[PDB]
A paper describes a structure:
The spike glycoprotein of coronaviruses mediates viral entry by binding host receptor with the S1 subunit and fusing viral and cellular membranes with the S2 subunit, thereby determining viral host range and tissue tropism. As a class I viral fusion protein, the spike exists on the envelope of virion as a homotrimer and each monomer contains more than 1000 amino acid residues that can be cleaved into S1 and S2 subunits. In this study, we report the cryo-EM structures of the SADS-CoV and HKU2 spike trimers at 2.83 and 2.38 Å resolution, respectively. The overall structures of HKU2 and SADS-CoV spikes we determined here resemble the previously reported prefusion structures of coronaviruses spikes. Both spike trimers have a mushroom-like shape (~150 Å in height and ~115 Å in width), consisting of a cap mainly formed by β-sheets of the S1 subunit, a central stalk mainly formed by α-helices of the S2 subunit, and a root formed by twisted β-sheets and loops of the S2 subunit.
The newly identified porcine SADS-CoV isolates are also found to share ~95% sequence identity with Rhinolophus bat coronavirus HKU2, and this further stressed the severe results of coronavirus spillover from bats to domestic animals. Recently it was shown that SADS-CoV is able to infect cells from a broad range of species including mouse, chicken, pig, monkey, and human, indicating a high potential of the SADS-CoV for interspecies transmission. For the SADS-CoV, ﻿receptor analysis indicated that none of the known coronavirus protein receptors including ACE2, DPP4, and APN are essential for cell entry. The final refined model of SADS-CoV spike contains residues 19–998 with some short breaks (residues 82–83, 134–143, and 488–490) and 45 N-linked glycans. Sequence analysis suggested that the S1/S2 protease cleavage site at the boundary between the S1 and S2 subunits is R544-M545 in HKU2 spike and R546-M547 in SADS-CoV spike. The amino acid identity between HKU2 and SADS-CoV spikes is 86%, and these two spike structures are quite similar with the root mean square deviation (r.m.s.d.) being 0.53 Å for 962 aligned Cα atoms of the monomer and 0.56 Å for 2886 aligned Cα atoms of the trimer. The SD1 and SD2 of the S1 subunit and the S2 subunit are highly similar in amino acid sequence (85, 84, and 95% identities) and structure (Cα r.m.s.d. less than 0.5 Å) between HKU2 and SADS-CoV spikes. The NTD has the lowest sequence identity of 70% among all domains. The CTD sequence identity between HKU2 and SADS-CoV spikes is 82%, and the Cα r.m.s.d. between these two CTDs is 1.1 Å, also indicating more structural variations in the CTD in comparison with the highly conserved SD1, SD2, and S2 subunit. Therefore, the sequence and/or structural variations indicate that HKU2 and SADS-CoV would also bind different host receptors by NTD and/or CTD of the S1 subunit, although their receptors in bat and pig are unknown and the receptor-binding sites on spike have not been defined.
Author numbering:
A (entry chain B): 245 to 487, 491 to 585
B (entry chain B): 829 to 998
C (entry chain A): 586 to 926
D (entry chain C): 586 to 634
Amino acid sequence: QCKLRLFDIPPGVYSNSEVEYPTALYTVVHNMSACPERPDSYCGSNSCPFKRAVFSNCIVNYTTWVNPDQRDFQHLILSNGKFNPFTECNGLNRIVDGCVPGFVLRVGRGKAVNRTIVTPYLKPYECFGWSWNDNQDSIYDWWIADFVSTGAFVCESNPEAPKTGVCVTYTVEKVTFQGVLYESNFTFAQYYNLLYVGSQLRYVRILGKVYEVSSCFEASYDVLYRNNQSFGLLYRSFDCNQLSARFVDRLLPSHNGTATVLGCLFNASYAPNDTMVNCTNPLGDGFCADLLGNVAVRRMTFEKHDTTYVAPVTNERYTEMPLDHQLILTEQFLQTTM
Amino acid sequence: TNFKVISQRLDKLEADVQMDRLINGRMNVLQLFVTNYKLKIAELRNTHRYVQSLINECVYAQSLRNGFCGQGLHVLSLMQNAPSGIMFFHYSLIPNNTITVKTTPGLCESDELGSKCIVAKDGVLVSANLSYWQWSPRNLYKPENLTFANVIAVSRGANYTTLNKTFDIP
Amino acid sequence: PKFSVSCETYICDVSKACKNLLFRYGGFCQKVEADIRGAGILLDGDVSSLYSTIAAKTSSVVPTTDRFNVSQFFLPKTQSSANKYESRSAIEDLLFSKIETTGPGFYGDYYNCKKNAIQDLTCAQYHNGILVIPPIMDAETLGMYGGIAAASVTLGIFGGQAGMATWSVAMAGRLNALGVVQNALVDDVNKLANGFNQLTASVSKLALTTSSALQAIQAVVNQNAAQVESLVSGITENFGAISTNFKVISQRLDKLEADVQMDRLINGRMNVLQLFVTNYKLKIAELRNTHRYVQSLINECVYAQSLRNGFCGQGLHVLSLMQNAPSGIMFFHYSLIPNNT
Amino acid sequence: PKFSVSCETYICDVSKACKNLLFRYGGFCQKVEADIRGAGILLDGDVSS
Ligand SMILES: *[C@@H]1O[C@H](CO)[C@@H](O[C@@H]2O[C@H](CO)[C@@H](O[C@@H]3O[C@H](CO)[C@@H](O)[C@H](O)[C@@H]3O)[C@H](O)[C@H]2NC(C)=O)[C@H](O)[C@H]1NC(C)=O
Ligand SMILES: *[C@@H]1O[C@H](CO)[C@@H](O[C@@H]2O[C@H](CO)[C@@H](O)[C@H](O)[C@H]2NC(C)=O)[C@H](O)[C@H]1NC(C)=O
Ligand SMILES: *[C@@H]1O[C@H](CO)[C@@H](O[C@@H]2O[C@H](CO)[C@@H](O)[C@H](O)[C@H]2NC(C)=O)[C@H](O)[C@H]1NC(C)=O
Ligand SMILES: *[C@@H]1O[C@H](CO)[C@@H](O)[C@H](O)[C@H]1NC(C)=O
Ligand SMILES: *[C@@H]1O[C@H](CO)[C@@H](O)[C@H](O)[C@H]1NC(C)=O
Ligand SMILES: *[C@@H]1O[C@H](CO)[C@@H](O)[C@H](O)[C@H]1NC(C)=O
């Protein structure tokens, strides 16, 4: 109804209804090491250059940039998702969820007067926050991240091997695509993780394993609609020669899709012998949807005509001459104006 | 959608990328109109050369083209106005029941060169498995006996049919 | 081939953040689907009137082809008692094999499914919200002189009133009507049968660098595959954006940059889809009148004897036969032109 | 009249800074030249017949 924008759907054939599938986002396709820590922002004698850390191609860890007391750092808490080490960002988007392009981090420390902490001006790709070393003594530590490169990809939780044999819309190295994967013995060049045969994605390489990408053939179907309790399904791009929970909770057989030249047919009769002369519901490729007693797929046929050409008679033979005629009327419409 | 409001509410960096969205948006709708309109004119240049042939040959004449004024033997075509075009009504005779009969280019009394021969006038010679020949119109089996002023007295031709009799036509 | 396009899945794949911004454009998604479905109606109207013209009455008593090798070249290849129903003729198989496909891709997979013609195997394909549906009759699977919409081989030279026994008798009376032989003997007809047989066996030696009829078929195959490939190249590339994922663009930039770079993917993808719909309607509007020319060559050259100079080829028209080609129909015209004077 | 169109010179005349940004559009320069050369073939086919 929401695809057709109607409440009382008349009988017909309604095409290209689609099926949803999960999402798998990969920013990097290989596992990494662990990140360094923070340098505590404490100096030995009186004052020394504050130690920095380069974060790239590693796994930052949860809340290991603050002290384990859960009263002081809580000014950097937003919501249930609260692990946000930045306060005002320039000019990138402030919330850090997922992955960030590989900053360099420098820390610091200062005395807190007025209980108000000021914002130094930021060049773009510099975003900073501040925590408390100790809150009742009012000494705050801070850190600013300088994203020196785009595409170093510090990321939590190293990615894992995908599920082979289910349609899911992947996103692997800035290229989102949909399909199923399978293990392959195909090897290609180490410069590349993606592979194209022409213009279609054919192989991906995830964690050193090469997976051949196949199109998931059950993403689209037609409905051979008759009423609320009787309709048929046709999957025009699926080949059910050999080998489902979406259809077990609509109609009786799990399996038992008929393999036709139109696609895989479900809960409809396939009668390629029988013909119809007035096809008010064509399916394509010579077929017709009969939607009057129940759901059935028949063959289309045409009424045969003759010619006014008569071959002239040059010897004695048999001829087939008409006994009477029928007057017909042919309306022909042609557009002449706008 | 008001161009004054957009420029009196935002700064001149945002009020010039959002006036390039109304303008670039509206230029596309108007340009897609003009392309679809020229796509229809270019189609009707040749549809008019087909309408003018059906008026001159089906409606204002009798045509000799098979299947042009509908299928069959063309009796009449009339033409009416339709919404945004013209509608032609074609009336034709198509065959209904058939019959298999014997037929011949013509009949001769004897198989010598110089015998009297006949052919049919304005129709065909048929028999329908009888001992004697008959005359029918060329597109309908409706037999008549042979008569003076129904056949034509000719010479021979390529393979006429010999009766070894004389014609009953006085 | 008919298409069925879901506009939202092409442009804004699963992103609800993207589907809110398509709503601000002025009826775009309604307009694309109404033009594809409207042009798929007009094409189904023309193919249906075409196969009501191909479908002709045949004799119950089939005349014998004496020395004309008609059934070898034009009639469907005689089905065995096995799982090999080759519905094409011998010429129709030569026309699909001499036409090369462009390269690997999505039209090459579609074209090779039709060329192979495996029984009860679907050729429809789905990618990214774009389905390839066969048309109402789909000539690329059929043979012209066999099946349910089968053409008549005999209706054009034996005429509307059946009864002549062989093709030698029929071609003898056609040579009389052309004014070249008063009464044709067996050597005048065999000379016509040998020329017919050598000219049809020479179709097997056509080269795409020389034949202007294969170049017309190849021009249709090359423009079908260049249109599919523009539609697949439109969703593998950012159009000035940073990526193709709409969540990543909005969770990495501020809301001034993540809304001018979501207007680059969307405005970029709306152009590729709109250029598809314009080129598709440009082909339907061309074939409205090409169908009125095909129906005249079937009724006047193939199913009758015509009196129009040069219409069925140059010269005194002996015979016209018709075969299926990739994405169209091919007419074979046989004519007598003068040689010595 | 037949045309022959070099897409890069029309849009991004000599600028290498411009020619890098045409590369991001989805096969534009390939598509324009294939349609001009394809329509110049069909016109040469009709004038020859
Ligand atoms: C005049 O005589 C001719 C010749 O005897 C008659 O034509 C013949 O009619 C028979 C009866 O229909 C045809 O035989 C049938 O053929 C079909 C198809 O093969 C088959 O299904 C039937 O069981 C039967 O065998 C025969 O073909 C036909 N002969 C020719 C040369 O066409 C004709 O009917 C007679 N006309 C009248 C008005 O008596
Ligand atoms: C047409 O001609 C035939 C023969 O020339 C006529 O058939 C004869 O009919 C009479 C009685 O009607 C019979 O006594 C003869 O024996 C018939 N002759 C033959 C050879 O069968 C027929 O009657 C004529 N019909 C008309 C309307 O004049
Ligand atoms: C037209 O058909 C005839 C009959 O099939 C062909 O003649 C045969 O050719 C084969 C060659 O493979 C010989 O083995 C037969 O002995 C021939 N039969 C007769 C009756 O001659 C003929 O070659 C065909 N013509 C063309 C041009 O293909
Ligand atoms: C599907 O088959 C089952 C068989 O019991 C039944 O519900 C019905 O006949 C068919 N159609 C639908 C819509 O369920
Ligand atoms: C009906 O179809 C089956 C399989 O397609 C075939 O074996 C059978 O001969 C057909 N019957 C008729 C009467 O056409
Ligand atoms: C007619 O007479 C001639 C001469 O006797 C004979 O050869 C021929 O067979 C006869 N034909 C018929 C139909 O009686």
